[PDB]
Amino acid sequence: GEFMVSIMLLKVEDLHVYRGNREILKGVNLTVEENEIHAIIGPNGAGKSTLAYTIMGISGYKPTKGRIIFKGVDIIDKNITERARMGMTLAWQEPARFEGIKVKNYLMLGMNEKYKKDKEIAEEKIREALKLVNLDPDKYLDRYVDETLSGGERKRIELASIICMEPDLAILDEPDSGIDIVSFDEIKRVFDYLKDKGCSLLVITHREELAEHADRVSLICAGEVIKSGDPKEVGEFYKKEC
Amino acid sequence: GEFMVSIMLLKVEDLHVYRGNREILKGVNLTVEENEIHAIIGPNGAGKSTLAYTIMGISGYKPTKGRIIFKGVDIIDKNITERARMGMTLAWQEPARFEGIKVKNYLMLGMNEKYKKDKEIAEEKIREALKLVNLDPDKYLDRYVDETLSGGERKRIELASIICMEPDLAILDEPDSGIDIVSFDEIKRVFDYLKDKGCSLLVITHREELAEHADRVSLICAGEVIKSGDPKEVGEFYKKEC
Amino acid sequence: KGPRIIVKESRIIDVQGDEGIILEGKEEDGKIKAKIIVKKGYKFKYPIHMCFGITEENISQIIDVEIILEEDSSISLMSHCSFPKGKGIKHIMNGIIKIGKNAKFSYNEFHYHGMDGDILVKPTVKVEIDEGGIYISNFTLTKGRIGTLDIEQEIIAKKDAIIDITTRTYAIKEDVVKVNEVVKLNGENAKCIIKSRGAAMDNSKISLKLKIEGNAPYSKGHIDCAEIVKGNAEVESIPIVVVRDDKARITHEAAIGSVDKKQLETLMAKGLDEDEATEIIVKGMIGDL
Amino acid sequence: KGPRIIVKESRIIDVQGDEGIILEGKEEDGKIKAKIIVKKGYKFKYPIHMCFGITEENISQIIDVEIILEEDSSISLMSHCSFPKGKGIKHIMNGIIKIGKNAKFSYNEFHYHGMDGDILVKPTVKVEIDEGGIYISNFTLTKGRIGTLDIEQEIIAKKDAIIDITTRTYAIKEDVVKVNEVVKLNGENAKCIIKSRGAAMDNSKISLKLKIEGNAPYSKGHIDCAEIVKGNAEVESIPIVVVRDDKARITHEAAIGSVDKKQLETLMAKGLDEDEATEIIVKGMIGDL
Ligand SMILES: Nc1ncnc2c1ncn2[C@@H]1O[C@H](COP(=O)(O)OP(=O)(O)NP(=O)(O)O)[C@@H](O)[C@H]1O
Ligand SMILES: Nc1ncnc2c1ncn2[C@@H]1O[C@H](COP(=O)(O)OP(=O)(O)NP(=O)(O)O)[C@@H](O)[C@H]1O
Ligand SMILES: [Mg+2]
């Protein structure tokens, strides 16, 4: 649909993604508007991860039918670096471990130009991001983002990376799982911080309770967007239909 | 305390567990009564896993001070097999993958004597357990409990193993995480099934929402049981104190 | 009754080949010369058989076979060895396999032996895979006493080839297992996996030399080795990885010795004793479970 | 100014040893004979230094050193090599290390070289560890042209010993890296870890032979190898695992070739191009980041 495209950041039109002989996404229609926290709910194996990797341009996740438009440009021929330079980034669910990369240097990668420039401002933005994800900056700044960290520490550092990057679109694959969340008030405090800065979040989750804190929610069932709109209406449909 | 011990299945008295130079558990007092779903809440690194491994008798998790009494017997000198033969079992959080062990043969391991005996009854109990954890029995019975399964499939098969085993005490390390839970109604249906059979569950969790469905809840903070009792009272204290 | 090659003792009992599958066979007194040719386009989805039976004392079953698969062809071979008497036996197979452009070959060899270890199973297989070809190999020796196993394979792969080699062994008493496999990924995007699984007990001796050469761009390889050690068994694992391209990637993982502590403790939490739990892990390892 | 051994060119500049740390040193014209003895009970927590500087052409710095640590002693040695001229240089170290009952030795060698590769660094280290002993070794050559590296180590460990050996290398131009380490866990509960990290570019040649022998009950070992390949570099990894006890367990993991796809794609999702992302992974791999 080309109505209200002037306020649309991302537009996935009838997307078909195949992984070998199997079709995972069977016609995905999804849009992300400016300054919106749009959540995606669905059961295990519905294609939540597949969709997130296809938008980011991860190798192997190539669409057969359909198009992905970001910032009015069809990114069909754009690679991961080119899509990231447009303002789009991804969380993963299991953030990759890196040999010999310190947290202080990792949080500088992809950092927004409004922080990256001044030295004393970039170093302060790192502290603000680590304090937001409940990590003691002095206890983690000189730690490596390697296998040595716990899954919760590494996923919290990935959330802090999103904060330092401050992207136009942040695709977050299961931000509340892997951190063994105590309460949604801690994840909401990060989501609201990014939203106040002008970011749009494409939060991928299986937890209906997390989706209720988003502005809009889309239910993906077997590679198709069944219901969309109000988080509580589509949430009530998710509790009954499968 | 030796008052009301006649209705106590498990009794952990002032338990101190060290992992090298660090003391993880610093005096744990916890009891599990008969036919009780007793949940344990706490932040990451509080010693939830350590406590679960010490009760099960996992190597390396040896108490320096304090005692663990199960069924009136001090199990200080009992190994994992001996504790399991008393009716105590554990879930792990990340259930181990096994080379060449089918789901149909894995679910027979440790199976309760009331099912294990009759052939047609043992084979039916497996189907009932897999149907309870929302897995299609015919799609998983001949699958291996190896790396090939997803984390959700392997943890659901571990939940089905608990069902077939029907232990007197089932220690469940994070039963709702790793399965990417859609709703608590699916985990409650399994918990109530075990409770109706006469089982006691020692559910280890970080999710306060999961603990409210238990009979009693104990809050572990830095190796110590701070508050205990009503799930909503200790839950309100967990939201504020850390 | 099915396209099969029967060899009882050191003599060919039967040699019958169907349409599009040329099966030649002759004897040079003890030495059997076979030649299998799968014609261009012929994709047989039903498996061909190859039975080897030895019940006589002092038999030297030496078979030289050449398997050629033409462009776009497909065949699956299921070799069966039954050596129950096991006194003075020697099954030696020397093979040359040539898989054509977009052809697919699959081989599965199972052994059933007696309790005496005077048997020597010695397969030597050279495999040449063309652009788009597929090779799947599986050798399983977990029944009775192996005796002395000496497997040697060398695979050369061109553009877009796929190789999957597996070995499942169960060595007992004074058994000797020797496995030496080399896979050379010499074409763009050629992929390979070498998997070794097994258990060694009593006074057995295992030597597993598995090698992958990543010589072309986008060639990928993975060696997965796992061998349980019980009693006075000795195991030696030598997994060589050579990389001659900046766009090639090979990884290897191995675990030799006692069973994993978490796996043992998980089964002991089910009420199984240390011996029952180890036996379950070992049975699953060798494919019995 | 600190307990140190200075060697500029092929001559000993200084030989000073403190209380409880006997430092002997002599010259046999080009050959340096050193002997370090840590006395029983002496646990020095501050690191000893050992500087090797070479600025002259055609220098053969051959040093034979013997390091003995008596029961319950402790020492950390930080060797520094600065070879900026690099024409005709040859640093050869032949060492015999004997770690006593409950003693602890730690060695860290760093190299800073120039851009000419006519340097040959050749350490040969024999280590003998008694009941309860600890050996920690770290060799890092990531600055300038390595030239030709030839490391050879053989460690023998008794009851309750702990070994941690690490190698970080960055091979460029026509560099040659040869690492041959063998660890024999010959005592109950002896534990070992051999870790190799590095990046090979241009026309470099790497050969890494890392071996662990699990010869006693409860002995554990782990080999972790990772080497990035760029340009026309060639890498060969040969990680041998021998197990001679049913209660011993050794595991090994290796990744040779191009950088991990998920790691590259994670950094490219941060806006970094393929070259910037690879450079970040390589810099972190060699310890620069
Ligand atoms: N490595 C793989 N091999 C085979 N199939 C895969 C692989 N990765 C993903 N798939 C397929 O992708 C689909 C799952 O989509 P995905 O979006 O990853 O899951 P999901 O619904 O997000 N669940 P979760 O991963 O728990 O968050 C299934 O049809 C899988 O078969
Ligand atoms: N392998 C290990 N090495 C070092 N410390 C460990 C290890 N395993 C556990 N610990 C310690 O155990 C404590 C964590 O307790 P544990 O019960 O595992 O965590 P938890 O609170 O349950 N969190 P979670 O694991 O997310 O459920 C910390 O003090 C860790 O340092
Ligand atoms: Mg996912």
Ligand SMILES: [Mg+2]
């Ligand atoms: Mg845990």
